[PDB]
Design a protein around this ligand. Structure first.
Ligand SMILES: [Zn+2]
Length: 178
């Protein structure tokens, strides 16, 4: 990684281990993206790609970087043309053979560290928070509670599934601004 000023990019990178609903909160989830990112030398601002009590997944990326700046993976490969494109309501269709990588470089969708290939997002297809399904703002992992998740094997990044919070799923980290 070396990128150019007139060449903006935002990385969607995965946390190194699957996590249940009991994420200690977004403050706790946010801190893990931070640690892991700088453990591998990444100079950006990483926030947990989730919808919480006081925020929508949409509002993680600063306005100036929402309309054009491409969303790439840890390998710089293209995921989404832009953030608006992602949150336009098509539930982020993963293009043919696109792959997401964890900070330590594992291909999340094909590595045994992630038995369950779903992503925790707690949002609707337009990146808005769902207070009835975001594991009580990622504080609980009670099987009775549920969080919005997407099945990477269903080809989407924002599929809609109220999933039991005891589940250890993938958690993503979006660089908040290039
Ligand atoms: Zn890069």
């Amino acid at each position: 990684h070396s990128h150019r000023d007139f060449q903006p990019v935002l990385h969607l990178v995965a946390l190194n281990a699957p996590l249940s609903g009991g994420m200690r909160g977004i403050r706790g989830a946010d801190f893990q993206c931070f640690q892991q990112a700088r453990a591998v030398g990444l100079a950006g601002t990483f926030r947990a790609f989730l919808s919480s009590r006081l925020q929508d997944l949409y509002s993680i990326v600063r306005r100036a970087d929402r309309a054009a700046v491409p969303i790439v993976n840890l390998k710089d490969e293209l995921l989404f043309p832009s953030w608006e494109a992602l949150f336009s309501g098509s539930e982020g269709p993963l293009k043919p053979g696109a792959r997401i990588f964890s900070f330590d470089g594992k291909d999340v969708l094909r590595h045994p560290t992630w038995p369950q290939k779903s992503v925790w997002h707690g949002s609707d297809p337009n990146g808005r928070r769902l207070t009835e399904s975001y594991c009580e703002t990622w504080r609980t992992e009670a099987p009775s509670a549920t969080g919005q998740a997407s099945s990477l094997l269903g080809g989407r990044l924002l599929g809609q599934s109220a999933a039991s919070c005891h589940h250890a799923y993938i958690v993503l980290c979006i660089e908040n601004s290039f």
